[PDB]
Coordinates of C-alpha atoms in Angstrom, one line a residue:
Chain A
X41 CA 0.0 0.0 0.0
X42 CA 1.4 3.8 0.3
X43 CA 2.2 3.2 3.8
X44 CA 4.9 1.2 3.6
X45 CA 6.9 3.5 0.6
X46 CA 5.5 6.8 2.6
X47 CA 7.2 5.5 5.8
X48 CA 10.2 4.8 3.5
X49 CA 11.9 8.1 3.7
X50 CA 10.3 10.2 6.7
X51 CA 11.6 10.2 10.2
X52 CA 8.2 9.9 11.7
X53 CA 8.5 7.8 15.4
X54 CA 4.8 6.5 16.2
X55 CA 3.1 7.7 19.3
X56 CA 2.5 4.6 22.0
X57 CA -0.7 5.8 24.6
X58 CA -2.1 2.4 26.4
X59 CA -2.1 0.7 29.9
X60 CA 0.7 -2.5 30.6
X61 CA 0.2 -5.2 33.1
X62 CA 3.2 -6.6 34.9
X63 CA 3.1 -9.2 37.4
X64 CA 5.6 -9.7 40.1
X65 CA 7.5 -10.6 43.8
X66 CA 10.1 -9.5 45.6
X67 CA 12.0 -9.4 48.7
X68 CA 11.7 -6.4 51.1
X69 CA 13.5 -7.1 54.0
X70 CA 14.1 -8.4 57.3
X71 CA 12.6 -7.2 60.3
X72 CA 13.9 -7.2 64.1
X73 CA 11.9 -7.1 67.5
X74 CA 13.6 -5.5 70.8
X75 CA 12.6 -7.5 73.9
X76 CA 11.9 -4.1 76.2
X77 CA 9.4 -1.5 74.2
X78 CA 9.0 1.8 76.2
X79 CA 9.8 4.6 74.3
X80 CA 6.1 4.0 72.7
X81 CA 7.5 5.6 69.6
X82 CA 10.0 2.3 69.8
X83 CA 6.4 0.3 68.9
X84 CA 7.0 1.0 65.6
X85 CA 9.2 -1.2 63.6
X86 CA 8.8 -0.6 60.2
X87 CA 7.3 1.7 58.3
X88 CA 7.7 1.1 54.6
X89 CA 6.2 3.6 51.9
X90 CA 4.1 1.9 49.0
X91 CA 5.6 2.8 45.7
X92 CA 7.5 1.0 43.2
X93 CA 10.8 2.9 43.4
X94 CA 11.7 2.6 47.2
X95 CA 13.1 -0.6 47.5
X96 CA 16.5 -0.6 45.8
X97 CA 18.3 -3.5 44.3
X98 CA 14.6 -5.3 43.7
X99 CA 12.8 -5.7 40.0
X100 CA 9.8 -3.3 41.5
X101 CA 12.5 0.0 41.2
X102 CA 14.8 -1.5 38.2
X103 CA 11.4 -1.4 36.0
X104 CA 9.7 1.5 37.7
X105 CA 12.3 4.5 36.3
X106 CA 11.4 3.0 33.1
X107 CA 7.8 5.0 33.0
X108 CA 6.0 7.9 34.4
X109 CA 2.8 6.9 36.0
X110 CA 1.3 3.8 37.6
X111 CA -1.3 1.8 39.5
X112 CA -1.5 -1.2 41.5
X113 CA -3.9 -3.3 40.8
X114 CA -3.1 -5.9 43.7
X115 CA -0.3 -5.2 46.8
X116 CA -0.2 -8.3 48.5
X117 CA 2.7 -8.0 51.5
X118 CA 3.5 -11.9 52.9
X119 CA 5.4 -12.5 55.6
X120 CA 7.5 -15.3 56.9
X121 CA 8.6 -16.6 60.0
X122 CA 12.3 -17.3 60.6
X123 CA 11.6 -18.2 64.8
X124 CA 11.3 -21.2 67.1
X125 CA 8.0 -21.9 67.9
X126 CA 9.2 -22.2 71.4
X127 CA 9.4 -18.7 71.4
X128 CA 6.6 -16.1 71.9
X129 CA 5.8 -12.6 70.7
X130 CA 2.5 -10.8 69.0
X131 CA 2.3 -8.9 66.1
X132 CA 0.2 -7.0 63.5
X133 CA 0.6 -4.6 60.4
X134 CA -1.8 -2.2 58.2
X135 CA -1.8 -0.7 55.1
X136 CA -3.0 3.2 55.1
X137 CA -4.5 4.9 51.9
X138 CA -3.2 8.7 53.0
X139 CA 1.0 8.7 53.1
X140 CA 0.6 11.6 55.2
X141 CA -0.6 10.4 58.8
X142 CA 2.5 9.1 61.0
X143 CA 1.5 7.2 63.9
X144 CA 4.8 8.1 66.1
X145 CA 3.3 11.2 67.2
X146 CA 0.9 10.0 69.6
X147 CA 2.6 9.4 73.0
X148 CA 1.0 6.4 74.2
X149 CA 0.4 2.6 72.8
X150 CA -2.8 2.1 73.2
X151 CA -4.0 4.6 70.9
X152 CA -1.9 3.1 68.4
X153 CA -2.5 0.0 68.8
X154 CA -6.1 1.1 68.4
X155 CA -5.3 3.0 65.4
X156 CA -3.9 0.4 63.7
X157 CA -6.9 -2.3 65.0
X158 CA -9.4 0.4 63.4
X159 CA -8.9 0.3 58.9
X160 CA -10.1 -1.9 57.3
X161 CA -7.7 -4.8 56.2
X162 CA -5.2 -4.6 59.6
X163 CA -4.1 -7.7 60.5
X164 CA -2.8 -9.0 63.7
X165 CA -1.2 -12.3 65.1
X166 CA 1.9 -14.6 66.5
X167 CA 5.2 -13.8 65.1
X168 CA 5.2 -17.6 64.7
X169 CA 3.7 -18.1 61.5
X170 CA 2.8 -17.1 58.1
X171 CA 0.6 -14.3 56.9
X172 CA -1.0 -12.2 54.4
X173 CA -2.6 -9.0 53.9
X174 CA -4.1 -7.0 51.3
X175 CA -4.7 -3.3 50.0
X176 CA -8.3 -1.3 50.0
X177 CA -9.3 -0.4 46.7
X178 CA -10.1 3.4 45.6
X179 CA -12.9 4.0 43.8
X180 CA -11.6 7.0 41.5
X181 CA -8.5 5.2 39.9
X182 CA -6.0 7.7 39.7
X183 CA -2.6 7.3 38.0
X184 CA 0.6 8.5 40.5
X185 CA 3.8 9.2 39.7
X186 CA 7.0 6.9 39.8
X187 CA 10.3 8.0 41.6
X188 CA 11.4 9.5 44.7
X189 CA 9.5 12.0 46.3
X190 CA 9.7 15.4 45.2
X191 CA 7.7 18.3 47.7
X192 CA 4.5 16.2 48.4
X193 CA 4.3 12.7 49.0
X194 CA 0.6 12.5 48.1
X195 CA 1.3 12.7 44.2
X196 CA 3.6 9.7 44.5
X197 CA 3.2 6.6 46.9
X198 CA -0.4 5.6 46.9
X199 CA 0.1 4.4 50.6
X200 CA 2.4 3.2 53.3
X201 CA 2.8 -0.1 55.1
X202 CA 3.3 -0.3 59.0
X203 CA 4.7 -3.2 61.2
X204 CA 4.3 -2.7 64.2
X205 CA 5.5 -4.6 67.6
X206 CA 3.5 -5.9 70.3
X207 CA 3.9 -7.0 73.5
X208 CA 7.5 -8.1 74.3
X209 CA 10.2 -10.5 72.3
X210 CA 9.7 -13.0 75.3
X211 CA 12.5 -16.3 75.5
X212 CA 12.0 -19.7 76.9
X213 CA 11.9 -19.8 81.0
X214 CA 9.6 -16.5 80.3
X215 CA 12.2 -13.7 80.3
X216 CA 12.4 -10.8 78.2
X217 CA 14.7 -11.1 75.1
X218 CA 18.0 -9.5 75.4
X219 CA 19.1 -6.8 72.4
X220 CA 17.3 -7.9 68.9
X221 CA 16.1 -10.8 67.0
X222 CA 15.9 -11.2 63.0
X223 CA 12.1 -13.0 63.2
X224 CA 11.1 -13.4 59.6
X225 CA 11.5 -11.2 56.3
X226 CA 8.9 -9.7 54.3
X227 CA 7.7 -9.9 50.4
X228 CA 5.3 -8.6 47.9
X229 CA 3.1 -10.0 45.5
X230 CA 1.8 -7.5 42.6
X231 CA 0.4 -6.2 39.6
X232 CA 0.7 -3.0 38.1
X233 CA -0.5 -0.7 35.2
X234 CA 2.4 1.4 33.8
X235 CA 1.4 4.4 31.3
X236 CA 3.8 6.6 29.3
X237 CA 7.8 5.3 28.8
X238 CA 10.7 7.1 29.8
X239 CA 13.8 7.5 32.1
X240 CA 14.7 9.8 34.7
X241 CA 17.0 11.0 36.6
Chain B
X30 CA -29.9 -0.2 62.8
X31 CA -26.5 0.2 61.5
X32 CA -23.7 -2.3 61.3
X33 CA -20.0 -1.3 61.1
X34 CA -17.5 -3.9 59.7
X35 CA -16.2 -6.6 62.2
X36 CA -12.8 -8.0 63.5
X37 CA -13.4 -12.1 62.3
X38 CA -11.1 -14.2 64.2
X39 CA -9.0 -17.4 62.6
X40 CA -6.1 -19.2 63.0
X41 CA -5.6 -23.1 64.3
X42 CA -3.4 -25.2 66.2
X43 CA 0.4 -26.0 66.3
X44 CA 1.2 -29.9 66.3
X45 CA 4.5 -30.4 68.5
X46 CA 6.2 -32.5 64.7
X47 CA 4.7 -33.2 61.4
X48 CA 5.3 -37.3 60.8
X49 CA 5.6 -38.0 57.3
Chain C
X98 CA 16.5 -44.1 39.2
X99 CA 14.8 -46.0 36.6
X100 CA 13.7 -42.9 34.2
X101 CA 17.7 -42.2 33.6
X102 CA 17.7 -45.8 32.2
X103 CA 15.1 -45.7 30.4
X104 CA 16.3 -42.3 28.8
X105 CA 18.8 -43.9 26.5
X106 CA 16.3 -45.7 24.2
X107 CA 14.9 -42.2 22.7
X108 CA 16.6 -39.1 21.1
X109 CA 14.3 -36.5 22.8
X110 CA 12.0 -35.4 25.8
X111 CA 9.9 -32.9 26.8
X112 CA 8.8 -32.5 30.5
X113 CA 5.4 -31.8 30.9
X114 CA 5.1 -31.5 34.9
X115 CA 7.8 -31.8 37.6
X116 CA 6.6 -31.2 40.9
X117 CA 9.1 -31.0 43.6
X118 CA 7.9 -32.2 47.0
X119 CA 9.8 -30.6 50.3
X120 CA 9.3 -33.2 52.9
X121 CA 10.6 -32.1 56.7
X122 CA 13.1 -34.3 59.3
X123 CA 13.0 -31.9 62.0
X124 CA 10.5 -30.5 65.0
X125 CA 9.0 -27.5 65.4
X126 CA 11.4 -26.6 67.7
X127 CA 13.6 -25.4 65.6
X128 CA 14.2 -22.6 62.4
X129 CA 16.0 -21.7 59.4
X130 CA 13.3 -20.4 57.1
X131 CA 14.7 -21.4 53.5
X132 CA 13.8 -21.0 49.7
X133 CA 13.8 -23.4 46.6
X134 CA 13.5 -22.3 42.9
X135 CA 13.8 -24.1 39.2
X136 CA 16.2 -21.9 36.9
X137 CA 15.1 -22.4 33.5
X138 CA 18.1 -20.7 32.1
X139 CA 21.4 -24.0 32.7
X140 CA 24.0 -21.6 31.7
X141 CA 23.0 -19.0 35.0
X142 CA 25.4 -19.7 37.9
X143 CA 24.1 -18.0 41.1
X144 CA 27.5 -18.7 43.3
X145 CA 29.3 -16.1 40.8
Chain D
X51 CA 1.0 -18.6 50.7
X52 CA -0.4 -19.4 47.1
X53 CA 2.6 -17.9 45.4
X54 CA 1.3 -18.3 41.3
X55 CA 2.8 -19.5 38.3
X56 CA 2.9 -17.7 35.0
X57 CA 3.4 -17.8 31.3
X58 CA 2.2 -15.3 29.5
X59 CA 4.1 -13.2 27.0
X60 CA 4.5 -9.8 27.6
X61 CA 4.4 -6.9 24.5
X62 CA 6.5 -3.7 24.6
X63 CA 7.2 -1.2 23.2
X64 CA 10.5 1.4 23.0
X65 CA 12.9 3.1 21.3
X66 CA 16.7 3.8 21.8
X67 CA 19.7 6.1 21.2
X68 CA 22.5 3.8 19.5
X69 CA 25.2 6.5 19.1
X70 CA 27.0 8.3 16.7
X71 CA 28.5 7.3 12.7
X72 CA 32.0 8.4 10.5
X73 CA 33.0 8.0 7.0
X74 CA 36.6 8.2 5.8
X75 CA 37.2 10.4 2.6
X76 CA 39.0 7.9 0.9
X77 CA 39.2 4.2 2.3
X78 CA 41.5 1.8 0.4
X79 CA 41.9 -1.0 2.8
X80 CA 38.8 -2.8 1.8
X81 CA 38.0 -4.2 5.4
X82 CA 38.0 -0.2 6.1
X83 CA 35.2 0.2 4.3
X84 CA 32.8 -1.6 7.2
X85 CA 32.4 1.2 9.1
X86 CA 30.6 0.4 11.9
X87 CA 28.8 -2.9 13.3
X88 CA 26.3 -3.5 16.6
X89 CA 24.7 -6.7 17.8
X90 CA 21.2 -6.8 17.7
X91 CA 20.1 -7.7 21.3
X92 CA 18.8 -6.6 24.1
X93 CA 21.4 -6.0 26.7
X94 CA 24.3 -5.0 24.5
X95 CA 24.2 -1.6 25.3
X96 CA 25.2 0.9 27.5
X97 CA 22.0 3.4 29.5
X98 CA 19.5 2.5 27.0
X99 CA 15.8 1.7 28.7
X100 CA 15.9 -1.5 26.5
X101 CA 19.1 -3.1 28.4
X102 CA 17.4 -2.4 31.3
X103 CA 14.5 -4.1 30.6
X104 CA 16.4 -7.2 29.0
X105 CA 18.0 -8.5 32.2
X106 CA 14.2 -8.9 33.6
X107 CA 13.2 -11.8 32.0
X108 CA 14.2 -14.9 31.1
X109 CA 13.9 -14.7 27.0
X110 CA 12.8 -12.4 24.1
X111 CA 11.0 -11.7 20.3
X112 CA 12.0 -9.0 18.3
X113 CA 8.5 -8.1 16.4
X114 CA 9.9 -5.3 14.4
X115 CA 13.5 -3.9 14.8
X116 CA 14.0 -0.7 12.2
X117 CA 17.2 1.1 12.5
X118 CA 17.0 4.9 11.8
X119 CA 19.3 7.2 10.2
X120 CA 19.3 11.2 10.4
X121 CA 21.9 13.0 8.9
X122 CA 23.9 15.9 9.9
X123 CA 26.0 17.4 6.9
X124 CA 24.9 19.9 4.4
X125 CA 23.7 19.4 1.1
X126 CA 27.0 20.5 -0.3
X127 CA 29.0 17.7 0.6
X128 CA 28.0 14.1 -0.4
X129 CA 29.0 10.2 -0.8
X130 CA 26.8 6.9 -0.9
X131 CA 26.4 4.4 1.9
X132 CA 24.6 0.9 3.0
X133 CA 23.5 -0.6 6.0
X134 CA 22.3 -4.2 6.5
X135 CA 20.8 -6.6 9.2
X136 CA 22.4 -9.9 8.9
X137 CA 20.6 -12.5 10.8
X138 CA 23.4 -14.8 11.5
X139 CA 25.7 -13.5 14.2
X140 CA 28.8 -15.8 12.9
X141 CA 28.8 -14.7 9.7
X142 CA 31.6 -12.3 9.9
X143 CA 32.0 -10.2 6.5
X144 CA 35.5 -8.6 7.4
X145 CA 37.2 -11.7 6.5
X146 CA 37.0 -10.7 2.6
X147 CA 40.0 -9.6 1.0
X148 CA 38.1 -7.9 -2.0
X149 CA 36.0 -4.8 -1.5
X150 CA 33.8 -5.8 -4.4
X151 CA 32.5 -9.2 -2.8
X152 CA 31.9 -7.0 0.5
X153 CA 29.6 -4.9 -1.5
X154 CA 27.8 -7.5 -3.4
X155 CA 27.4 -9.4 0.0
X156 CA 26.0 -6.9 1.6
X157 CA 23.7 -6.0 -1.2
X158 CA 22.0 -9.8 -1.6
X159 CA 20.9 -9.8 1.4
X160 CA 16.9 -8.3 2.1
X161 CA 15.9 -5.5 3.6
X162 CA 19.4 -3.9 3.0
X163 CA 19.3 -0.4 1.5
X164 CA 21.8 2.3 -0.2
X165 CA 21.4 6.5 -0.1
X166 CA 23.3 9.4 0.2
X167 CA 23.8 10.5 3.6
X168 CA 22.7 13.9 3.2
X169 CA 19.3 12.9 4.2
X170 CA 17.3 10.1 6.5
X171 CA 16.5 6.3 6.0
X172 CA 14.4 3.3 7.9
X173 CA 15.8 -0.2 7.7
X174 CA 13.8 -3.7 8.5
X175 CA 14.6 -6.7 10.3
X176 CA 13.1 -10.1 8.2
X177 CA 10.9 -12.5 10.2
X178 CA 11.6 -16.3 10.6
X179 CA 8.9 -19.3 10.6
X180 CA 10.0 -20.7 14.0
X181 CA 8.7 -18.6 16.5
X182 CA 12.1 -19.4 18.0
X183 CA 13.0 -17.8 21.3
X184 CA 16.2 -16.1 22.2
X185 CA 18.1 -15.6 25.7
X186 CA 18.6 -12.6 27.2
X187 CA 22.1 -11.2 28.5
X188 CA 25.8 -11.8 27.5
X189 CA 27.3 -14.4 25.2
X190 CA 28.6 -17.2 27.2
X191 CA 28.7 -19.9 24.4
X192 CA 27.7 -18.8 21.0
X193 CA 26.4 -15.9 20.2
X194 CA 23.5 -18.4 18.3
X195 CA 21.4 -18.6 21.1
X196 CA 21.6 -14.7 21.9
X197 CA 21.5 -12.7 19.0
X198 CA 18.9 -12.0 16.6
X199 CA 21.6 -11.0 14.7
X200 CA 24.2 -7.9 13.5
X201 CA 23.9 -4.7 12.3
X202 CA 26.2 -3.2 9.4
X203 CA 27.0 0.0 8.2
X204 CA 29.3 0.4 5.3
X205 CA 30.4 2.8 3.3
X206 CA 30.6 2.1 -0.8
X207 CA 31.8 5.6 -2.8
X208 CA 34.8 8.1 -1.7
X209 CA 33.2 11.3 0.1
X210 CA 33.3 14.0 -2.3
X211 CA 32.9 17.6 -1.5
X212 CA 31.6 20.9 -3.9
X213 CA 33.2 20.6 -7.2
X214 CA 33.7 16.9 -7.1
X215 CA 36.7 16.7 -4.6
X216 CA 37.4 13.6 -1.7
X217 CA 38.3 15.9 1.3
X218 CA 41.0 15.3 3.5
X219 CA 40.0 14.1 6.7
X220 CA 36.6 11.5 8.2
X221 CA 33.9 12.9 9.6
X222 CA 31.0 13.1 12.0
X223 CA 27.7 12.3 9.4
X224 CA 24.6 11.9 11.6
X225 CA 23.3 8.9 14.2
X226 CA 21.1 5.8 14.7
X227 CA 18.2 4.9 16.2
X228 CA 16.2 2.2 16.6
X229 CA 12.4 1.9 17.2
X230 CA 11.4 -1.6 18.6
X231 CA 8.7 -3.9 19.8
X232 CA 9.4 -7.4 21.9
X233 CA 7.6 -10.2 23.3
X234 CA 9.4 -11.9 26.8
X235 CA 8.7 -14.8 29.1
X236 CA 9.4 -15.6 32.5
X237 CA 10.6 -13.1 34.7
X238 CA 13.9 -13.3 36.8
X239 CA 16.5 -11.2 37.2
X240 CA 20.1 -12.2 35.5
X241 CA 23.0 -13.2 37.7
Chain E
X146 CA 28.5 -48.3 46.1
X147 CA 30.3 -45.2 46.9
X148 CA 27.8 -42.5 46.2
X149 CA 24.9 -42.1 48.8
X150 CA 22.8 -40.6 46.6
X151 CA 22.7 -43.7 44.3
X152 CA 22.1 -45.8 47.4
X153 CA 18.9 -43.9 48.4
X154 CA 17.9 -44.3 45.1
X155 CA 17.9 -47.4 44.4
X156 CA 16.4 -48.1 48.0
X157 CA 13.4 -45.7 47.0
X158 CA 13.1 -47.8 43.9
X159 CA 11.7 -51.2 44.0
X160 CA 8.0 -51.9 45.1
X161 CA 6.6 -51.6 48.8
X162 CA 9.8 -49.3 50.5
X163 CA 9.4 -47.1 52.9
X164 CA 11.2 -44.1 54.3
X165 CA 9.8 -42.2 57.4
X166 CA 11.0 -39.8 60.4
X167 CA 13.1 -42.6 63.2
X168 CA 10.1 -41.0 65.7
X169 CA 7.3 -43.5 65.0
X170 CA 6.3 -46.9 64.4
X171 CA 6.1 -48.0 60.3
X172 CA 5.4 -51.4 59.0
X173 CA 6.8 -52.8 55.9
X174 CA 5.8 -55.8 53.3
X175 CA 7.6 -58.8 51.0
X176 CA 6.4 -58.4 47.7
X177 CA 4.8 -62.0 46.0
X178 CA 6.8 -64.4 43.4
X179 CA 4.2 -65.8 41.1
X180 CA 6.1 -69.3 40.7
X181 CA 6.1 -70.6 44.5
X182 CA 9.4 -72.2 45.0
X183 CA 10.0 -74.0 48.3
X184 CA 13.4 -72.6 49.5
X185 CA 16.1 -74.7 52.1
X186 CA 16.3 -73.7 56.1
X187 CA 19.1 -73.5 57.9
X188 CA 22.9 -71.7 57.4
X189 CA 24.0 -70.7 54.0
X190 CA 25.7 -73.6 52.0
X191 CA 28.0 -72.5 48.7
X192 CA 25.1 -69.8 47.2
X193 CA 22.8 -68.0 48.9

């Protein structure tokens, strides 16, 4: 046809608008518990924020420069046990929607503790074994932005993870852990929707 | 009346060895 | 294992399942936490 | 813990900066005359977006794979030029003593094309029945199971200037690019 | 032998073996001979 002969000689690079699935896992981290919380703030163990480009050295950041906007589609965090089950400490985690809350503020437990028990989705149980927790959905489907955070964190990370401590690292014979302990590592299982190709900075 | 959503308990038990 | 002598009567194979099966020796009083994958790529060479 | 298999195929779209291309005024060395050559894989270069993606899967399809070329010298100066796509990596074409088998070479093959290089060409990749799948990453034995293949660019006439005259020294003469689009597999990440 | 691997293997091999954790009582079966041979008692004599 005259496509192929007008394309022969004229430096015209097509346009490319449309949505691409990925699906994924990878490997967060490792996560300690201190046998004597008191510091309240100290309840918190690990905050994490929700984007693709914040965990460095994993496949999530190495394809996320490679685009400009994106949405999860599922954000499933795992976690696995690395302890004894002689041992005995409680745990939970939630996911939160708004990046800009922080928990540490408040100076006692409780409320945090109810904080985190109130959101849907919060999960809570023995660091013993294995568990899973999920994202809530938003209605609107809005596309953010990829990279590190520039001014305000609401354009970017469409949420932030918290693990958080409970009761004390406790030993056999019943007395409280000295210094730390590794306790398990956690992962992610997703799918995302990138839009427009690039690289940045 | 209006209901608000609830906590739903789970889990199980721990068996002292797995004999396969 | 039988299979690797029956192997030599035919030119070619094709897998179509292979499930491996992690079975445990030890009690529940104890931990490593540990992961096992299937490399389809022979050439790869993690220890490098 | 219902961690899921996959095994899907995965389109994509891109396109890359491959750098910058000479020409000598009067090349007499016959194996000169090749004037520049690029594999055509994914993780052969260096910065692009497409290396990047290579190492992220386990193996890849090249749908389409047109090289680019824009000039940059006036329409005062002038010389001819080729550029071909062979699809086997150990071919090697430097090994002919005669510059007139080089060219003739180079011209059977499809999809190769000839201009002057005062002004902007496409180029084409051919297809093959097999549906064949390549691995990502570095050479480790053959280049066979890597490569789609190699990228030529050779030079055929002198490089004359206004009023019909070789000049004295080679020169910058524009750049290529390449738009692409790429089917992978499984997803890993390469050691 | 001298491999262990090839040892376990040819012990999972062959019908009605059984491998289980030292912990707990197994029981374990002869497999049949379809042509019913009477065998000799007492202490080996020349072959087995």
């Amino acid at each position: 046809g005259p496509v192929p002969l007008l394309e022969s000689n004229s430096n015209m690079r097509q346009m490319h608008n449309g949505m691409t699935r990925v699906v994924g896992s990878d490997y967060l981290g490792v996560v300690s518990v201190a046998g004597n919380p008191a510091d309240a703030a100290a309840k918190v163990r690990k905050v994490l924020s929700v984007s693709p480009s914040s965990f460095p050295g994993t496949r999530l950041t190495q394809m996320s420069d490679l685009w400009e906007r994106y949405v999860f589609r599922q954000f499933r965090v795992r976690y696995v046990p690395s302890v004894p089950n002689t041992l005995a400490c409680q745990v939970m985690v939630y996911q939160d929607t708004d990046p800009q809350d922080d928990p540490t503020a408040i100076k006692d437990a409780d409320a945090l503790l109810r904080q985190a028990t109130a959101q849907t989705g919060s999960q809570q149980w023995n660091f013993n074994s294995a568990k899973v927790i999920h994202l809530a959905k938003r209605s609107d489907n809005q596309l953010y932005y990829t990279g590190p955070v520039k001014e305000n964190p609401r354009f970017n990370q469409q949420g932030v993870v918290y693990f958080i401590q409970v009761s004390q690292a406790l030993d056999m014979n019943g007395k409280p852990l000295t210094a730390d302990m590794e306790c398990g590592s956690l992962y992610v299982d997703w799918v995302i929707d990138f839009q427009t190709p690039q690289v940045n900075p | 009346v209006q209901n608000a959503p609830r906590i739903q308990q789970g889990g199980g038990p721990v068996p002292l060895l797995e004999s396969n």
